Amino acid sequence: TTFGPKACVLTIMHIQDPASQRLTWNKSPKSVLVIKKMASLLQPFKELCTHLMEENMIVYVEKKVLEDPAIDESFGAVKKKFCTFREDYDDISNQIDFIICLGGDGTLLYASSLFQGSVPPVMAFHLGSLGFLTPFSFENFQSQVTQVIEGNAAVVLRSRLKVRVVKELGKQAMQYQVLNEVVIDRGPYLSNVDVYLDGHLITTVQGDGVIVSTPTGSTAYAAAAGASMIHPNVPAIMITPICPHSLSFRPIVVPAGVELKIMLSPEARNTAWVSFDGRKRQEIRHGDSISITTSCYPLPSICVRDPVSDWFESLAQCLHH
Amino acid sequence: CPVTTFGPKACVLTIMHQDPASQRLTWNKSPKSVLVIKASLLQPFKELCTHLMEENMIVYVEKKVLEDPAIASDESFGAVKKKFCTFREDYDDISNQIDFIICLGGDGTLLYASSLFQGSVPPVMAFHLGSLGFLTPFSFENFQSQVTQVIEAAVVLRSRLKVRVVKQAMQYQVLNEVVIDRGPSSYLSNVDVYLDGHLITTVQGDGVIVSTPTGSTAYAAAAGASMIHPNVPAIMITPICPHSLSFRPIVVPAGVELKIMLSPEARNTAWVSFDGRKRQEIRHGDSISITTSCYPLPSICVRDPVSDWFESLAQCL
Amino acid sequence: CPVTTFGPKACVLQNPQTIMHIQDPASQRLTWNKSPKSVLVIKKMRDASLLQPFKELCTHLMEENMIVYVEKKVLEDPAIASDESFGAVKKKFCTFREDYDDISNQIDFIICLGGDGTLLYASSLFQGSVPPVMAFHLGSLGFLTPFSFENFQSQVTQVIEGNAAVVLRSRLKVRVVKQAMQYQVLNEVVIDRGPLSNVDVYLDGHLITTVQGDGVIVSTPTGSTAYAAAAGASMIHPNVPAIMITPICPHSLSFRPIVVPAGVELKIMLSPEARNTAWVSFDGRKRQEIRHGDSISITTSCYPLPSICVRDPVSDWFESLAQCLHH
Amino acid sequence: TTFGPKACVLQNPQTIMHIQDPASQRLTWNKSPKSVLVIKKMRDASLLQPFKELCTHLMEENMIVYVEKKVLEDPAIASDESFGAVKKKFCTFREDYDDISNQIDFIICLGGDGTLLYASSLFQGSVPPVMAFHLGSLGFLTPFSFENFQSQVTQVIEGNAAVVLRSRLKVRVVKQAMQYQVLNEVVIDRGPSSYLSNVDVYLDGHLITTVQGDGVIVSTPTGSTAYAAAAGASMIHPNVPAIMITPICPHSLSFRPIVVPAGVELKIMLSPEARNTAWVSFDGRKRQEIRHGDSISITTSCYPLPSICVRDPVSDWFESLAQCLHH
C-alpha cells in the first residue's frame, strides 16, 4: 500500500479469499433437490435417489421427471417416497437444504431459476463429458455425497447478475437472477440500445444486440460472440456486442461493482428484446429500463479439488477436444 | 459483497482486507523530487519543468533529453537546463530517489516509468497532448493548478506482472505484457503453458501473450483479447494466431502462477519480450514464471478509476 | 493466360465445351438501344440532408423532358408536402405504390440518392432484368454510391448520352418451397433462429453441416460489406464470381466464413431434430418462417444489378476501400 | 444482356475473354509417365509402410522413383533389410543443390501439410501433375485414400483424371530482381521489431493502406486453409479466381480480410516513414529483409499447381469441408 518513498493509499472491504473458501452446515441437510438433464442418467438417477432416502432424507424432483415412461416396478417403492413440485406453479426456494445436479448443460441454469434469492449448495455430477459446471464423477458417489454433507467442502461462489426491468404503467419493476447472461437483441437490422455504466452513456449498440454475462456465462453464448473465457473467481461483468456495426467494438470486461443501465435510444425506430439465460424473453419499449448489477446471491458450486484446479481441468479437457 | 448464507442450513466458513473505485492518494511527506518523462512536447516540457522548479522541487530527467539540440540550442531555457538532476538510463538506479512521476505524451512513457521502478512505483500523473489514449488522462491546459491539486487525488492501481526467466534467474516487472513468440521460425510454436503446475495446453501458432488489464488495450487487443478495466484483478493469456480456432483468449485470477516453456518435442526455439523490450531466446530447459507483482503502478485519475477508462473507451469507439 | 502444359509429359485438353466466353468484368460499358425517357428516383428514408439534392435532381430530370417516378410515400413526407415551390414539380411525378404496383418494365434507368438500403430497394422492385443504377453519395463515399452530387447535371447527361462503365453486381435467386416462392437478393439471405438453430446446409446436394448458432448468412460479393461483414466475413470485390456462406455466432468457433464458386446450388432446411423453427429474410425484408419439410434453394441469379461506375469497376472499389481504411 | 426495357451491355470481341471452365478440367498424358517424384511428410512414422509399399509398386511398374537424399537416411528406412533392394534403385537428389524441375513426369505426395508446398518450391516453372494421398485425416490438399492405391495410380496414368488447377502467386522482389512461386502465401511481417510495422499496400498502382500490426498475408484460395485461416481469413474454394489480403493482428480492428480479382497487381513496400524493417517469407521459406526502396510485386502465376482429383474439383472440396466441420 506504499508507493515510492513518500506516498501511500488511504471504504475497506472484507472479502474471503476465493481460492480458500469452504462450505459449512449450521445443521445437517434433510431436504435434497435432484435435477437431471432433460436417458444415460436414468440408472444414476435411480441409484442416487435410493441412496439419499436410505440416508433418511426427503428428496425433491420436478413432477415431469417421475412421469417419464422409463421411471420400473423395482423403483416403485422409491418413486412413491419423492416430494414433487410443479415448475410453473410451486415455489420450493425455502424448502431445499442442498442441490444435486445429474448431468451438465442447463441443470445449473434450472437450479438458478428456482432460487431467485439465496441459493443452497450445488453438487454437480458429470456422466458424459466433464464440461465446466459439473466437476464430480458419478464413480464412488455415496462417499462423495457423505464427504460433502459431513465435511467442509471447497466452493466456487459463481456470481450471478441482478436484472431489474422497470416498465412504465405508476411503474412496475421485475427482478431476475441470471447465472450465465442477459441478452438485449434487436427485433426483426440495426438495434438502438443505449448502454450506461454508472450513469455514463458508454455507447449506442447498433447491431444484433449485446450480451451482459458473468464469468460463468463466458463459456456460454458470449463465447460464440467473441468473448474471453473467464475463471469464475475473477470478480467482473462482461459486456459483449453481438455482430456489432462498428468492428472496433471489442468485448469488454468491467468491475463487478458497476451498475449498467440499458434502454432504447430516444431515436429508436424498432423495439429491443431482453432474455434471461435464454428464458423469459420480453419486449423493451421506450421508457423501459434494464438495470444490471452483480447479485448478492451467488450460486455456490461445490468443488472436487479446489476452485482453481477444477476450472484448469475443465479448460485442459476443452482444449484437448 | 455477497450474502454468506446459502439456503436455510449452509454458509461459508484466510479473510482478506480497499474498494478499487474509492482509492485516493496520500502523502506521508510532501513531494520534493519529481521525475519528468517525455517535437510538439518541447514547449510544454520547458513550461512544466520551469513551473516545478519555481515550486521549489528537484526535477529529474534522463541525460539524453537535455542532449537534444531543440533543448541545447535554446539559450533562454539554459538557466532551467542547468538546474535539472540528471540520470543515465542503463547506469543509474533512481528507484528510491523519486517521490512522484509526470509523463508528457502518450505511448511508452508509462512503460519507461515501469522499467525504472522494478520495486515500489511512485504515483504517475500522465498528460496527453495529441490523442487521449488510455494511460494519459490529464489535459496540459491549466496544468499548474492540476499539479498543485495532485500534490496538495483519485488513483487506479494498475497491476504489473512479476516475470522470472530461468535458463541463471532474471526478474522483470512488466506493465502491459510478456510475449512468447516463434520469432523467425516458419514452423508453428511449441510452447507449453502451465497454470499452478497444471499443463493446460501446448500453444501452436505465432505464440502467446500474457498481459495485465492495462495491457488489454495494447498488443493483446490486436490478437483478439477483451478490453479489461484496470480495476479487475486478473492475468490474461491470449494466443497469437492460434492453429486451433477454438482456442479463445483466457482471463485467470490474479493469484495464479504461470509457467511457460518449450515443449520437449519443440524443433525450433521461442523468443520472450517484456513490454516490447529486452527480446531474448528461450531454449530447451529454460522457463518463464509469471505471477501478479506486489508492486502495482499507481496511475492518478482526472475524474475517477471508472469514469477515466469509460472516456478512453468513448474516444476509442 | 495460364500455361496448359504440366511438366514434360502432361497437359490439359482445351475442349470447346470447357472454354467459357465471358466479357471482361473490368471493361464492361452501358449501351442505350433507345434514349431513356423514364427515371426512377430512390432516396434514403428519414434523412433531411437529401431533401435539397432530391428536389434539385427531380427539377433537372423533368427540365430534360423525362418522366420521373417516385414511391407515393416519398411525396407524402411533410418536408416535401409543405414546400410550395416544389408544387409544380410535385404534380408532374408518376407515383407508384410499393406493395400494389409493378413498375419493372416501365423504368429505363434508376438514380439513388444516398447509400444504405437505396440499392437493395431498387433490387426488390426489379425481380427480373434490372435497369442501370446510378448511385450518388452525399455524406460518406460508401461502397455502392460512387458519384458525387457536385456537377450531377453533366454526369447524368454523360450516363444518358454516352457509353458509361458498369459493374454487374451479381444477385442470388432464392426459391422457397413450403407452394414455391422466388426472390432476388442483392446482398444476402439470412436464415436465423427463433427466440441453438438446427439448420442443415447442402452444397450441390451434399450435406455439409448442421448450423448450431444464431444462423447463417448466404451473401453475394456486394453483400460482403453488409451484414456478413459484422459476422466475420471478408470484403469481396464485386468482380469476383462467388457465393459466401457466413455462420452467425457459431457454436463451433472453428466454423469459419466460406467462399464457394458462383455456380453452386445451396439447399437450406431445418434439421429433423429441430425443436424450434427458423426464419428466412431477403435483404432484411419479407421475413418468413421455415417449418419442417420447407426448403430454401440458393443459386446465382441470371439478372445481375448493373451499377454505373464513376471511373471503372476496379478503381471505384479500390477508392471505396482506401476511404474505408482511412476512417 | 438487357437491363430494363432500353439498355444493354455491348458484347464486343475485344472485351470477351476465353477462360477454361475450372470445374471441367481433366489431365492428358502426351506420353506415358516414367519418372515419379515421391514426397512424404517429415517426422511421421505412420507413412513409412505406405512409402515402402508405394515405391516397390512404382518400380515394379518399370518407373524411376525420385526421393530427397534425407528420406533414405532415416534409420526406419536404412535398417529395413527387406527394403534394401528398392532403396538401391532410387534416384536421390539434394534439396537446395540439385534442380529436378525438368526430370519429373509425375508427383505423388504421401501425407498432407507441407508436401504440396515442397512440390511447389521444386517446380518454379511448369508443375507436373500431383497425386496426393492422405493417411491420417482427409485435409484439404490430399484427396486420395491409400486403400487400393495400385488401381488409382493406374487410373491416373492410363486415364483422363479430373484436375483442380490450384493457382499460385508470382512474387518479384526488387531489392537485384528475384522471382518466387508460392502455393499458399507470401507473408510480410515486422519480424523482431517491437514497433508496429509500416508496410504500404498498392493495388494496381493505387495506395490502399499502410499495414500497422504484425504484418500482412497475401494468399491464394489454396492458402486460405493455411496461415491466413489463423489470422481471420475465409475458406475459399480453389476454383474461385482471386487474391486474398489478410492483415496479421492489425492495429485497426476494422481492417477486415480482403478478397480481390486474380488479375490485380499488388506492390508491397516499406512506408517512407518506416522506422523499422519488414521481412518477406514465401510459403514460410526463404525469409529475407525488406529495406527502404525494396519492393515486392505479386500477381497470379501463369504456372498453377495441377492437383489430381478423387472425384471432381467441387465434390473433393465439399467432402474436405464436411470432414473439417465434423471434427
* Grid cell listed for C281: 429474410
Residues closing a segment before a gap in chain C (C–N exceeding 2.5 Å): 178, 195
> Going by C-beta distance under 8 Å and a sequence separation of 6 or more, which residues neighbour residue C55?
C80, C83, C86, C89
Q: Which residues of D touch A (CB under 8 A)?
A: 252-254, 256
Rounded to whole angstroms, the Cα distance separating C98 from C70 reads 10
- Give CA A307 to chain center in angstroms: 16
Buried b (16+ CB within 10 A) or exposed e, A110-146: bbbbbbbebbbbbbbbbbeebbbbbbbebeebeebbe
> Cα–Cα distance between B83 and B33 in angstroms, integer?
13
Query: b or e along C223-259 (b: 16 or more beta carbons within 10 Å of the residue's beta carbon)?
Result: bbbbbbbbbbbbbbbbbbbbbbbbbbbbebeebbbbb
Q: Which of A216, A203, A201, A242 is nearest to A294 (CA)?
A: A216
Distances (CA, A) of B166 to B189, B261, B266: 20, 10, 18
**D8 in any annotated domain:** no
Euclidean distance between CA atoms B164 and B170, whole angstroms: 6
Which structural domain, as residue segments, surrounds residue C200?
171-302
Clarify whether residues B191 and B284 are in a common domain: yes
Which of C249, C251, C254 is the best mutation test for B, with the most CBs of B within 10 A? Answer: C254
In a domain, D2, yes or no: no
For residues C110 and C153, membership in a common domain is answered with yes
**3-state DSSP assignment of residue C57:** helix
Helix (H) or strand (E) holding D19, with range, is: strand D16-20
Co-location of B253 and B219 in the same domain: yes
Kindly give, in sequence order, each residue whose CB lies less than 8 Å from that of residue A297, ignoring residues fewer than 6 positions away: A115, A116, A117, A118, A119, A160, A177, B2, B3
Annotation marks residue D74 as catalytic: no
Examine the domain organization and report whether D72 and D137 are in the same domain. yes
Whether D185 and D168 have beta carbons less than 8 Å apart is answered as: no
Alpha carbon separation from A117 to A112, A161, A301, C272 (Å, rounded): 9, 12, 15, 39
What value does the CA radius of gyration of chain C take, rounded to a whole number of Å?
22
Q: Which of A259, A99, A278 is nearest to A181 (CA)?
A: A278
Mutate which of C46, C189, C249 to test chain A, going by most A C-beta atoms within 10 A? C249
Neighbours of C216 (CB within 10 A): 26
Asked if B74 and B45 count as a contact pair (C-beta separation under 8 A), the reply is no
> Nearest residue of D to residue B108 by CA position?
D195
Q: Is A193 left (phi over 0), alpha (psi -120 to 50) or beta?
A: beta
DSSP state of B186: S
Q: Which residues contact D84 (CB under 8 A, 6 or more apart)?
A: none
In D88-137, which residue ranges form alpha helices assigned H by DSSP?
115-122
Q: Are strands B161-166 and B155-158 parallel, antiparallel or unpaired?
A: unpaired
C325 and D208 Cβ atoms separated by less than 8 Å: yes
Dihedral angle sign, alpha carbons of residues B297, B300, B305, B308: negative
Q: Which three cell numbers stand for residue D145?
A: 485414400
Q: Which three cell numbers stand for residue A242?
A: 453481438
Q: Is residue A312 part of a domain?
A: yes
Angle at CA D326, nearest 5°, toward D325 and D327? 90
Other CB atoms within a 10 A radius of the CB of residue D48 amount to: 16
Q: Are residues B169 and B239 in the same domain?
A: yes
Q: How many CA atoms lie within 13 A of B77 on its CB side?
A: 21
One-letter amino acid of C227: Y
Beta partners for A125? Answer: A102, A136
The torsion defined by the Cα of D153, D157, D162 and D165, in degrees rounded to 10, comes to: 100
Give the total number of structural domains in chain B.
2
**List of residues 6+ apart from C262 with CB closer than 8 A:** C170, C241, C242, C243, C300
Closest CA to C130 of C104, C161, C100: C104
D69 phi, psi to nearest 5 deg:
-45, -45
Q: How many other C-beta atoms are found inside a 10 Å radius of the C-beta of residue B272? A: 23
Helix boundaries (H) for chain D: 48-60, 69-73, 75-79, 84-87, 115-122, 149-158, 227-230, 313-324
| DSSP state for residue C162 in the 8-state scheme | S
Catalytic choice (C47, C77, C101, C116): C116
What grid cell was written down for C1?
A: 493466360
Nearest to D237 by CA among D317, D141, D165: D317
Rounded Cα gap, residues C327 and D3, in angstroms:
35
Helix axes A42-54, A141-150, angle to 10 degrees: 50
Q: What distance in Å separates the CA atoms of residue D77 and residue D90, rounded to the nearest whole number?
A: 12
Report the DSSP pairing between strands A31-36 and A98-102.
parallel
Spell out which residues of chain D touch residue C168, defining contact as CB-CB under 8 Å.
9
**Residue C244, in any domain of the structure:** yes
Please name the member of D192, D248, D251 whose beta carbon is closest to the beta carbon of B241: D248
Q: Between chains, do C254 and B248 touch, taking CB under 8 Å as contact?
A: no
Question: Are B52 and B142 within one domain?
Answer: yes
Residue among D85, D86, D140 nearest D112 (CA): D140
Q: Which chains touch B (3 or more CB pairs under 8 A)?
A: A, C, D
> CA nearest A198: which of A254, A116, A275, A127?
A254
Cβ contact B222–D251 (<8 Å): yes
CA atoms within 13 Å, Cβ hemisphere of A211: 30
Q: How many residues does chain D have?
A: 327
Strand partners, B194: B199, B259
Count of Cβ atoms closer than 10 Å to residue B196 Cβ: 17
In a domain, C139, yes or no: yes
Q: Is residue B152 part of a domain?
A: yes
Burial state string for D130-150 with b = 16 or more CB within 10 A and e = fewer than 16: bbbbbbeebbbbbbbebeebe
How distant is the Cα of C255 from the closest Cα of chain B, in angstroms? 8
**Chain B closest-CA separation from residue C253 CA (Å):** 5
Same domain membership, residue A216 and residue A200: yes
- CA angle, residues C12, C13, C18, in degrees to nearest 5: 105
Instruction: Report CB contact under 8 Å: D242, C244.
Output: no
Give the resolution to one decimal, in Å: 2.7
d(C-alpha A166, C-alpha A155), whole Å:
34
| Cα(B127)–Cα(B133) distance, integer angstroms | 10
At D266, is the secondary structure helix, strand, or coil?
A: strand
Residue C83, CB half-sphere, CA atoms under 13 Å: how many? Answer: 17
Indicate the residue of A224, A247, A275 with minimum beta-carbon distance to C249. A224
The three-class DSSP label of residue D286 is strand
Give contacts of A60 with chain B, Cβ < 8 Å.
none
H or E element in which residue C158 lies: helix C152-161
* Whole-number Å distance between alpha carbons of B161 and B173: 6
Q: CA-to-CA distance for B20 and A254, rounded, in angstroms?
A: 12
For residue C231, the chain A residues in CB contact (below 8 A) are: 243
Give Cβ neighbours of residue C291 (< 8 Å, ≥ 6 apart): C178, C270, C277
Question: C231 and A243 in contact by Cβ < 8 A?
Answer: yes
Phi/psi at C161 (5° precision)? -80, -20
Is residue B15 within a helix (H) or strand (E), and if so which, with residue range?
A: strand B15-16
Q: Which distant-in-sequence residues (6+ apart) come within 8 Å of A214 by Cβ? A: A158, A159, A160, A161, A178, A179, A180, A181, A237, A238, A294
Q: Are C186 and C208 in contact (CB under 8 A)?
A: no
Cell numbers standing for residue B14: 484466510
Residues D327 and D227 reside in one and the same domain: no
Closest residue in B to A253 (Cα) is: B228
Same-domain check for residues A141 and A222 = no
B48 located within any domain: yes
What is the SS3 assignment for B282?
strand
Q: What are phi and psi of C144, to 5 degrees?
A: -115, 0
Best of D249, D251, D253, D258 to disrupt the A interface (most A CBs within 10 Å) is D253
Are residue D298 and residue D279 in the same domain, yes or no? yes
Cβ neighbours around B28 below 10 Å, total? 9
The amino acid sitting at D277 is: T
DSSP code of residue A153: -
Look at A248 and D254 and tell me if their CB atoms are within 8 Å: yes
- For residue B13, the chain A residues in CB contact (below 8 A) are 21-24, 152
In B, minimum Cα distance to D280 occurs at B184
Cβ contact B183:B269 at 8 Å: yes
Distance CA B95, CA B22 (A): 27
Q: Provide the annotated active-site residues of A.
A: 105
**Residue type present at position C6:** F
Looking at the complex, report in whole angstroms how far the Cα of residue B281 sits from the nearest Cα belonging to chain D.
11
Residue C280 lies in a domain: yes
| Cα B144 from Cα B52, distance rounded (Å) | 9
Nearest to B279 among D192, D214, D287 (CB): D192
**Contact assessment for residue A216 and residue A179, using Cβ atoms and an 8 Å cutoff:** yes
CA B74, CA B72: separation in Å to the nearest integer?
Answer: 6
Domain harbouring C248, CATH code: 2.60.200.30
D74 and D136 both lie in a single domain: yes
- If one counts every other C-beta atom within 10 angstroms of the C-beta of residue C19, the result is 12
D203 SS3 class: strand
- Nearest CA to B126 out of B155, B169, B98, B93 is that of B155
User: Are C145 and C191 in the same domain?
Assistant: no
Distance CA C130, CA C305 (A): 6
How many of the other CB atoms lie within 10 Å of CB of C56?
A: 14
Which of C252, C253, C256 minimises the CB distance to B248?
Answer: C253
| Residue A300 contacts residue A119 (beta carbons within 8 Å) | yes
CATH number at residue A105: 3.40.50.10330
Give partners of C (≥3 CB pairs < 8 A).
A, B, D
CB within 8 Å: C214 and A188: no
Å between B271 CA and nearest CA of chain A? 23
B211 in Cβ contact with B232 (< 8 Å): no
Experimental method: X-ray
